[model samples]
Target: EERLTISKRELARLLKELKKWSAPATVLLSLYIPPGRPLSDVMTLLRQEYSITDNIKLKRTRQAVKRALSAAMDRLQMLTSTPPNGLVLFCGEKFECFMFSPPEPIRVFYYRTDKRFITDFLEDMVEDNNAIGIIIVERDQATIGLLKGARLEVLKELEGFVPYERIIEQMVDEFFKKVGEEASNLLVPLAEKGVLKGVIVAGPGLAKQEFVEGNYLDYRLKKILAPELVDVAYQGLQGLKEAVMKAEKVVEAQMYRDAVNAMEEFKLHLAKGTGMIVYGEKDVEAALEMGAVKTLLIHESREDLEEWVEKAKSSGAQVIVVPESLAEAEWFLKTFGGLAGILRF
Candidate 1:
């Protein structure tokens, strides 16, 4: 059976390609249809758009708009029903046309004819749903951050009063409650959107456990909390970063780890002086042509990334985009000129 969701690696590459395309005039067509939407309804709308384009005074723009709409409708005719996640289409100047189901569900129906295709919603999906929530709680303060795509962004901070022995224990309880409420406020929305791959609660003391065990986190968050509570030497944002570093196994997404592993595998082959490794665009493409590449590593910033990816996919080679989030990603880019592969022979 086909996979339900498009791989993030593939989706990212598609988004990059789409962003590079544009029209000289407002003739570009972008259509987003939510799941279960009838193709006939969209075809009708495209027909109306095609007729409306006749109002354009510029002959070139008018012709381009009509052709885009016609191409969109023709592509839509091939699909009897929208895919589970939804359908996205782009038909614009330069005879460019693209259509596919997004990785996440499209909630709103959006149709636009602009100089560029509308890609904001698809961009949102690429990051939001994959973030891992980080809450480093101590009695004095709590730091909330999100780890998504190898970047750690501190979202909010909550401070607490200093502890006092004179029946001021109740004050600490109140602060704990406040922290829980605030965490719930920030995390619940992400939970609703199927974000929060996992939640990490860490700190230097018992407060982390107290905050986590106490009904401080939303039940949804509590369900996915990283099982191992970490202890960071510092507090606040530093603590949040440390928490991520310490709990890499639980919080880091599988794709990133795979990337790091791929780099290591390539490095090992190089160390052993094996002929199984290839780097540089010319050499890698030659290996790809021979169907000898077992794995392909392309840095995110590479100019010909899509061309290499297409070659790798057609040759049945695994493609991994080494994003800048990993420290060695930049190093790999500079060392290998942004394109490298492991060969079977």
Candidate 2:
């Protein structure tokens, strides 16, 4: 029961496609079977559902319901065991029969006859879970922002103490204390609620160092701080923007990290002359045909994305779409033609 990975972009497209479907009645069936659920039990439930479809008064609705149930049961019969992340099946209108091994584990066994596919769980799985906290700090001011997906939402701005001709050490200490307390107050709630993944403390001066090293942040905030302190010249919102631009690697989402790691693995395998790696389109596809691929890495902008994804999925290989935003993406395309595989061999 190997885990399968789908890119966020592909999942979004799938969700949109699923949403476009609807029915005149509750004939559209969406069934979720958790991993390790016995196929026999599911088949029995579907059998009972097929028998109960006889009670529907509307002929069209009744026919559609029975067909949907029958189709689902037929597909279920083909599976000897549930997939690792479990299974999702959508059967109903337009001869549409869609089944998936979801990228995330199915926590519950659910069955529903509805006008649309039940995509709540899928939607939840694709929701942006990599929210990063940004703290742009300096002596004069500090700006707190949340980097959620593509949005850098400024949560708070604090004006620090501006020093006079003679710098007062005690006043500087107080300002640092205030800045730390404010950052903690603003970002702790997000950390507590579980959205904040990591916090990047950035500034041009040693104030950021003082703030981060000092006992200013909540314990939880301290735990999630990005170790790399970024240096950005400016203050407030401008500094926040600069910090984001400079802290690329530190602030990268999990997908980017995963893609980078996959690239490293590809390179390592090649360097070691391990046959457990394949590169370029033809070579990767040849390995895929042989069911040798454990994971398929492809550039997101490729024209053959859907085709490659289908082939990889059919052969039970995990797919990772390397986004162009990645630093190694261009190099990957140049070196490997934007397609590669880590093979089972």
Ten contiguous residues with the weakest lDDT in model 2:
1-10
TM-scores, in order shown?
Answer: 0.56, 0.42
- Give stretches of model 2 more than 4 Å off: 1-10, 131-148, 151-345
Best-matching candidate per lDDT: 1
lDDT of 1 by residue, 1-345 (tens): 023357667778789889988777887888999886788888888888778887999989888888888888888877778888888888877477888888778879999989998898887677656778888887778788877755666788988886546556576677878878888888878887776678888888798888887777889899989899998877665777577767867735555456767888988998899989888768887888889999998888887888888999888899988876556778887888778898888
Poorest lDDT segment (10 consecutive residues) of candidate 1: 1-10
Per-residue alpha-carbon lDDT of model 2 for 89-197, expressed as tens digits?
9898858788878777887999999988898778766766677888887777778877655345578888856765446656667777787888888888768756678
Cα displacement (angstroms), candidate 2, residue 262, comes to 30
